[model samples]
Target: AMGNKIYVGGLPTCLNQDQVKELLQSFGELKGLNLVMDTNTNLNKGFAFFEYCDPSVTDHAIAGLHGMLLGDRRLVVQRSI
Candidate 1:
């Protein structure tokens, strides 16, 4: 659990954490991110779990940011186990 983490869900509830660390830094070398919510309807039920710096940038963030899109929101990466 020190690297190679990826478990992003359908985020985009006005994404935070520096806009998800600048949208996953063009697919590489990140190492720690956590954004989860629903604190009595605080929204962001989508989810997030990050940590990367290898595995070919977590396989290029599961092939170019999973399901793609950001401005309108669309994310659902993988590799978390």
Candidate 2:
């Protein structure tokens, strides 16, 4: 059994779950997601865990989004272990 969970970075603080879900769903259907939050400061950690409904799309997501920019910041898209 294999579950591919993707890691994405470069999330701005203003974005909510709906915005994020929509952004990622273009790659594939989302199984679920968890936004990584700041522990002490609050708001954001600029990263998240992405799980897709179909495992096949993980690679496409990484390939498409890696090093891509959301505004001036570079996005980090990678397989999470």
Candidate 3:
């Protein structure tokens, strides 16, 4: 399977797409991004999906962000199927 996609969980609900983009952009060009949201309040659902154009950078992103604290939550980063 392609290894470009990553699953990020335990994100702070306060973080928005712009922040997410800024945080991950250093790894590589982003191919796709989705931050789960609540339909009613339109708030972040504490998780997200990220696809990097350079697959090799995926691991770096994971390594750099995983377990890193953002607000009160520590991110859980892993490969997406």
Candidate 4:
């Protein structure tokens, strides 16, 4: 699967879609992005899902981002098993 989903959490509430996109693009190109939001506030809920153009890059994404510090929170990146 060239395109597979990955879970990303511990995101900074201030990060917009563009920022997230740019940050994740560091590991690999993205097929898509889904930022969980709060209906009442229309802001990120500290988590999101990303689809990488190359599924093989999934581990690299996880390894590069997982436990990596972002602002005050450490990232939690994982394959969408």
Number of the predicted model whose lDDT against the real structure is largest: 4
Give the residue spans of candidate 2 off by over 4 A: 39-42
lDDT of 3 at 77: 80
- The segments of candidate 3 whose C-alpha lies over 4 angstroms from its true place after superposition are 1-3
Supply the TM-score for candidate 3: 0.81
Model 1 agreement with the true structure over 6-75: per-residue lDDT tens digits: 8878677665656765677668767777778777967677868887767668876788788876466777
User: In terms of TM-score, which candidate is strongest?
Assistant: 4
- For each candidate, give its TM-score against the true structure: 0.34, 0.81, 0.81, 0.84
Query: Candidate 1: worst 10 consecutive residues by lDDT?
Result: 13-22
Q: Please report, in order, the local distance difference test score of every candidate based on alpha carbons.
A: 0.74, 0.79, 0.79, 0.80
Question: Candidate 1 or 3, higher TM-score?
Answer: 3
Weakest 10 consecutive residues of candidate 4 by summed lDDT: 66-75
How accurate locally is residue 56 in candidate 3, as Cα lDDT from 0 to 100?
86
The reply for model 4, stretches above 4 Å from the true place, is: 1-3
lDDT of 3: 0.79
Q: Root-mean-square deviation of each candidate, in angstroms?
A: 9.4, 2.0, 1.9, 1.7
lDDT of 4 by residue, 27-79 (tens): 99988988888889888898889977888888888988787765666668888
List the candidate numbers ranked by lDDT, top first. Answer: 4, 3, 2, 1
Cα displacement (Å) at residue 32, model 2: 0.7
